[PDB]
Structure formats: C-alpha cells, structure tokens
C-alpha cells in the first residue's frame, strides 16, 4: 500500500519509534534520510528546547520526521501518598549511601497542561506530530493539520482508536501488547485489554477506515510483511533501533539487550507509575504486595525512580535502569540505523 508513504511524503512505510531517552536527532535523521520516518520525543523539555531539538533534526535531514508528545491526563500531586512512597523506597536509597528526594515533581508535562507546546509546533511545522497516552481536542489537531502537519495518535484498543478518529488524526498507531516501553492505554484505571499486535491491527484495519500503523514485536521484513497482510499501512519499530550507534542507549542498556536477558520482557507500573514493558530488574516489583503503599500518580513515580537510578548509578549499579524492550527483543540486531532501515526494506522485498 502507498497509503501511508504518500500521506507523509516518504519512500518507506517504516517509522523508527520516538523513544524518550533513547531516540536522538542523529537516529531520526538517519532513518529519515534512509527513506523511512525517523522520530524524536520532546516531552519533559521546555518548549524552546523542544524547538531546538527539532531544528537539530532539520540540520541533519531535509526529509520528513516525526515529533512525539505525551498527552496523558495531567498528574495529580499527592504529597502524602508521595511521602509514603519515598519512605518505602528508603532502604533502596540507603543501599547506595543515599537518601530519597524530599519532594517529587511532575517531570513530564502533558500536552494538555503545557499551553506553550502547540504554538511552538505550529511554528516549526514538522512533517508529523504524534501523541501518546491520549488524543488532543479536535480543534488542536485541526490547527496542526491546517499548517500541513500530519497527526498520529497511539491507540491500544478499538475503543481508543474511535477516540483517535473523533480527534481527527491522519493515522492511528496500533500498539499491541508486544510493544516495548510505556503502553498507550488512555485510562489505565479502567484496566487494560492488553490486545496483541496481530489481533489489534486486524481489528483496526478491517473495521476502521483510518490508515493503521502497526507497533509491537516487529523486528524484521517478515514482521513488516505480516503487518501489511493484516491491513496495516505502515509499521512503527522501537526495540529494533535501540542497538543502533545513533541512539542514546547507554552501555549497560546495550549489553542487556544484546545478552540473554532479552529472551524475557515484563510489564511494570512501579518504575514510572504507568504500565511499561522492559527487561525485568529490581524496579519490577509487585505493587499489590504486602507493605507496598498506594502508588503515586504518573509521572511523580518516575521522578522517585529516576532519583534512585541516579544513586544506583553513582555506585556502578544498573539494576534499576529503565531498559525498555518489546517481546521481539531476542531478534535485536546492531547496525547503523540507515543500514538497518535498508536491510528491512530489502527483507520487506
């Protein structure tokens, strides 16, 4: 199908997934120059810094690229809950001769609570703007579209996909249970249908009319071929690009992904406050276990964890790192992004 590639003015139906902390302008430009759609994530950063990152990408590529923003429900501070969480983490900090932070901060501002992001986006005009955890109001999506920007939203169910349609997006990113990183569920408090890529992509393509981008578990040309047979118009690959040299994955992350840990992934809500999939470690614990206090809101939880990670890292310890990977992780390859992009295009045939 030409549906997606024509929609975004690119050659290849391949998006390199925006991965906050792992994607980079070098990674994005590499994929975009190679004919796909490279991406960056700019949540957690001030608008002008977002604006700089976009321009960094432009200085590397003249081809379309994707800019991703978190659109979650703005986190609700709860100092009592947050204090009880910190006290619970106290022995972990003490292990590295450290103390937990005194307070926690809303480190990731939602697109719905930072008014300055939309106007900056309407100025920079990246070819694509994608959202995770929810959809903006239709008039906001329309404003970006009015300026030539394609709008992507991640959905995890047919019900969420309907909301993406109502928001007026140009394409839906259909994220199956296989996907590495944070799950795109809109309202985790209602539960999580946890639908696999194969079913979700088929359900959205066969019973919907929006171009579908399949995300989760896709690691090669056979996977891409399979996604297209299901009716997707393109794929989004995260894990597959992590070992690329252009990525900002650290040493230990690359080692975990290259090694035997890659055979088994798991979901955690205790790392960030929102369900996410990666290589299990000490930050993957049972929040339902005895003596574990109620969980603070996302993203305050991640703030607490990031403080612990820093303390851990200050003693050579990476057992608390966020090493996100999808269920196809064992098929991970290590190539320069543009060479990987083209290997995929070849395997895609």
Ligand X SMILES: Cc1cc2nc3c(=O)[nH]c(=O)nc-3n(C[C@H](O)[C@H](O)[C@H](O)COP(=O)(O)O)c2cc1C
For its own copies, the binding residues (CB under 8 A) are 158-159, 176-178, 193-200, 202-203, 206-207, 216-220, 222-223, 225-227, 229-231, 263-266, 288, 326-328, 330-331
> What contacts 326, CB < 8 A, 6 or more positions away?
178, 179, 180, 181, 216, 217, 219, 238, 239, 265, 277
> Which partner, ligand X, its own copies, none, binds residue 158 by CB below 5 to 8 Å per kind?
its own copies
Residue 336 CB, shortest distance to ligand X, in Å, is 18
Q: Which of its own copies, ligand X, none has residue 175 at its interface (CB below 5 to 8 Å by kind)?
A: ligand X
Nearest CB to its own copies, comparing residues 95 and 220: 220
Q: Which of ligand X, its own copies, none does 236 bind, CB closer than 5 to 8 A by kind?
A: ligand X
Binding partner of residue 229 among its own copies, ligand X, none, CB cut-off 5 to 8 Å per kind: its own copies
The minimum distance between CB 291 and its own copies, in angstroms, equals: 15
Q: Work out the angle between the directed axes of helices 47-58 and 117-124 (0-180°, nearest 10).
A: 20
- In whole angstroms, how close is the CB of 9 to its own copies at the nearest point? 27
Write out the residues near ligand X by the rule CB under 6 A.
17-20, 22, 41, 68, 132, 154, 175, 178-182, 215-218, 236-240, 324-326, 328
- Distances from the Cα of 236 to the Cα of 4, 5, 66, 219, angstroms: 12, 13, 11, 10
How far, rounded to the nearest angstrom, does the alpha carbon of residue 135 sit from its chain's CA centroid?
Answer: 15
Alpha helices in 110-250 (DSSP H): 117-124, 138-145, 158-167, 197-207, 221-229
Contact present, 319 and 252 (Cβ < 8 Å): no
Residue closer to ligand X, measured from CB, 154 or 344 = 154
Q: How far is the CB of 271 from its own copies (least distance, A)?
A: 18
E-strand ranges in the chain read: 14-16, 38-41, 65-70, 128-132, 150-155, 171-175, 181-182, 212-215, 234-237, 266-268, 276-278
Instruction: Name the residue nearer to its own copies (CB basis): 149 or 340.
Output: 340
Max CA-CA distance within the chain?
57
- Closest listed residue to residue 257, CA positions, set 318, 348, 176, 347: 318
Question: In the bound complex, what is the minimum distance in angstroms from residue 220's beta carbon to its own copies?
Answer: 8
Q: Return the one option of ligand X, its own copies, none that residue 215 interacts with (CB less than 5 to 8 A, by type).
A: ligand X
Q: Please report how close the Cβ of residue 181 comes to its own copies at its closest, in angstroms.
A: 15
Query: Minimal distance in Å, beta carbon 71 to its own copies?
Result: 23
Complex with its own copies: residue 30 or 271, whichever CB lies closer? 271
Position with the least CB separation from ligand X = 238
Phi, psi at residue 343, to the nearest 5°?
Answer: -65, -40
Q: Which does 53 bind (CB under 5 to 8 A by kind): ligand X, its own copies, none?
A: none
- Cα torsion at 111, 112, 113, 115 (round to 10°)? 70
Q: Rounded to an integer, what distance in angstroms lies between the CA atom of residue 305 and that of residue 231?
A: 39
Query: Which lies closer to its own copies via its Cβ, residue 217 or residue 299?
Result: 217
CA 16 and chain centroid, separation: 10
């Amino acid at each position: 199908t030409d549906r997606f590639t024509r929609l975004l003015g690119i050659q290849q139906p391949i998006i390199q997934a925006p991965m906050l902390g792992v994607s980079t302008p070098a990674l994005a430009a590499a994929v975009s120059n190679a004919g796909g759609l490279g991406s960056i994530a700019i949540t957690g950063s001030a608008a002008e810094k977002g604006r700089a990152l976009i321009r960094e990408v432009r200085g590397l590529t003249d081809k379309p690229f994707n800019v991703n923003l978190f659109c979650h429900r703005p986190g609700q501070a709860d100092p009592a809950r947050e204090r009880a969480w910190l006290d619970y983490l106290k022995p972990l900090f003490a292990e590295f001769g450290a103390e937990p932070p005194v307070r926690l901060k809303n480190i990731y501002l939602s697109f719905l609570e930072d008014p300055t992001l939309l106007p900056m986006l309407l100025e920079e005009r990246p070819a694509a703007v994608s959202f995770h955890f929810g959809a903006p109001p239709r008039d906001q999506v329309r404003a970006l579209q009015a300026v030539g920007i394609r709008v992507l939203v991640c959905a995890t169910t047919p019900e969420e996909a309907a909301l993406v349609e109502a928001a007026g997006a140009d394409a839906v990113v259909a994220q199956g249970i296989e996907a590495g990183g944070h799950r795109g569920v809109f309202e985790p408090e209602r539960g999580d249908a946890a639908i696999g890529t194969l079913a979700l992509v088929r359900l959205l393509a066969a019973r919907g009319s929006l171009p579908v981008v399949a995300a989760g578990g896709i690691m090669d040309g056979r996977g891409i071929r399979a996604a297209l047979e299901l009716g997707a118009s393109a794929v989004q690959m995260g894990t597959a690009f992590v070992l690329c040299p252009e990525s900002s994955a650290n040493a230990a992350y690359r080692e975990a992904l290259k090694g035997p840990r890659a055979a088994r992934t798991a979901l955690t809500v205790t790392m960030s406050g929102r369900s996410a999939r990666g290589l299990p470690n000490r930050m993957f614990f049972d929040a339902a276990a005895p003596g574990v206090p109620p969980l603070p809101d996302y993203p305050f939880v991640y703030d607490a964890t990031k403080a612990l990670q820093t303390a851990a890292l200050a003693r050579g310890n990476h057992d608390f790192a966020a090493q996100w990977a999808g269920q196809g992780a064992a098929l991970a390859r290590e190539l320069p992004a543009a060479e990987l992009l083209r290997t995929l295009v070849e395997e895609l045939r």
